[PDB]
Amino acid sequence: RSLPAALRACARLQPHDPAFTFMDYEQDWDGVAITLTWSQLYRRTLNVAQELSRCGSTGDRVVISAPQGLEYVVAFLGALQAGRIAVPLSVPQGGVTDERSDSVLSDSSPVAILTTSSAVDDVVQHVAPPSIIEVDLLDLDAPTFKEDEYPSTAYLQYTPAGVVMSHQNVRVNFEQLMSGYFADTDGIPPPNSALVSWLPFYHDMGLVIGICAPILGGYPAVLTSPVSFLQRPARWMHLMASDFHAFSAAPNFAFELAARRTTDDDMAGRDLGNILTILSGSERVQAATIKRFADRFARFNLQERVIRPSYWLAEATVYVATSKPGQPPETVDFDTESLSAGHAKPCAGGGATSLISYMLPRSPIVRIVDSDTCIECPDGTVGEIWVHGDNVANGYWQKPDESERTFGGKIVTPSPGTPEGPWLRTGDSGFVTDGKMFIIG
């Protein structure tokens, strides 16, 4: 049920159905849609894996350092198909004098690096060796794999520590994410709908949301790059106002950006009424942002209920909880002074801190824990948010200590129904009350 097996099944079940579409705005301002059906995507994946099989052995790492695009996608899936541990990274940044890539390479000791012609120069400047493969230069479309002793680890996620993400972790994150998009359908996307996403593949749920999820869900995805989004934020609205029912996800700032930079003219002839769900990240969330976004696009048929607040851990790659499914999110005002003192009390007014209401998840599990004692906090008492579940990684690559410290939390005298561990210490402060959780920050 790993990605390679998921893709193989899609190749067989629906060979000629569109699978991945990358909107390239680098040449054409209106954007050129580069599409690959499931069988074509699968074929390109087999060919990459075939190339990788000549370097090193099963379990070796293969870094991916390419720009946002279909080369990155097949490169990633190619690594998995070959029984290698992918290391999704971005094209090296910071110049020749910057050692953030050198550090990640030195920590993972990859056997090869998958990149593209456009990035090969920068990538080589940071490889002081692993084989350098220019994906776009291969016969990706040229018309049998071990997949027996393949590693349990799918890839390493860096930000120098690499979170070890297993196939299980990826699969379960996928399951919960989909539950977030479609809480009322067991996480299954209705007919003629597709994921829209411009989130970077190298970090922050970008990989899981844009590549993994669609492959495992067997649904098409319309992708683009963060640079193209910044350049013309209206493009995100266009993609969700295309000839399919869209569902997307994005950081809180993206809604402010899209609302302010998209003109009424940019929306001429666009209807946003068929949108299914747009998850909004919980990092740096501004209360009014979502409503403003909804208010400015209301005239173009945007339904306010589609915007769903979601809580995920970008660094540990963990989908945690979501608002109530059915309509705009619920925000509660708490007394600031009290809350600053560690206690939650509903005083709704002016100087109060308004927090978004997230339903406590079934999976993973959330517990508010006193970071100093490792003992759960009664409802209403602020503490650190601890999470436990099959989508929570076991630790970092070759760092037992750190893994223990971060992913190995154990709760003291756990209350009934609460496992002793292991728990991921999120580093987030928050609380629970009436079956709901809130994040202060």
Curated annotation (Swiss-Prot):
GO MF assignments: adenylyltransferase activity; ATP binding; fatty-acyl-CoA synthase activity; ligase activity
Provide the site residues for: Important for substrate selectivity.
Answer: I209, W312
Name its pathway. Answer: Lipid metabolism; fatty acid biosynthesis
Q: Which reaction does it catalyse?
A: holo-[mycocerosate synthase] + a long-chain fatty acid + ATP = a long-chain fatty acyl-[mycocerosate synthase] + AMP + diphosphate; a long-chain fatty acid + ATP + H(+) = a long-chain fatty acyl-AMP + diphosphate; holo-[mycocerosate synthase] + a long-chain fatty acyl-AMP = a long-chain fatty acyl-[mycocerosate synthase] + AMP + H(+); dodecanoate + ATP + H(+) = dodecanoyl-AMP + diphosphate
Q: Which Gene Ontology BP annotations are present?
A: biological process involved in interaction with host; DIM/DIP cell wall layer assembly; fatty acid biosynthetic process; lipid biosynthetic process; symbiont-mediated suppression of host innate immune response
The effect of disrupting this gene, in the record's words, is:
Disruption of fadD28 abolishes the production of phthiocerol dimycocerosate (DIM) on the cell envelope. Grows normally in liquid culture, traffics into host (human and mouse) acidified compartments early after phagocytosis, suggesting it no longer arrests phagosome maturation as well as wild-type, impaired growth in mouse macrophages.
EC number(s) per entry: 6.2.1.49
Keywords, comma-separated and alphabetical: ATP-binding, Fatty acid metabolism, Ligase, Lipid metabolism, Nucleotide-binding
Activity regulation statement: Inhibited by acylsulfamoyl (acyl-AMS) analogs.
Q: What GO CC annotations are associated with the protein?
A: cytosol; plasma membrane
**Per the record, which residues fall in region Disordered?**
403-422
The enzyme's first-digit EC class, named in words, is ligase
Q: Which domain of life is it from?
A: Bacteria
Q: What does this protein do?
A: Involved in the biosynthesis of phthiocerol dimycocerosate (PDIM), a cell wall-associated lipid found only in pathogenic mycobacteria. Catalyzes the activation of long-chain fatty acids as acyl-adenylates (acyl-AMP), which are then transferred to the multifunctional polyketide synthase Mas for further chain extension. Probably plays a role in host phagosome maturation arrest.
Spell out the family assignment given in the record's similarity comment.
Answer: Belongs to the ATP-dependent AMP-binding enzyme family.
Q: What is this protein called?
A: Long-chain-fatty-acid--AMP ligase FadD28
Q: Which gene encodes it?
A: fadD28
Location of this fragment in the whole protein: 4 to 459 of 580
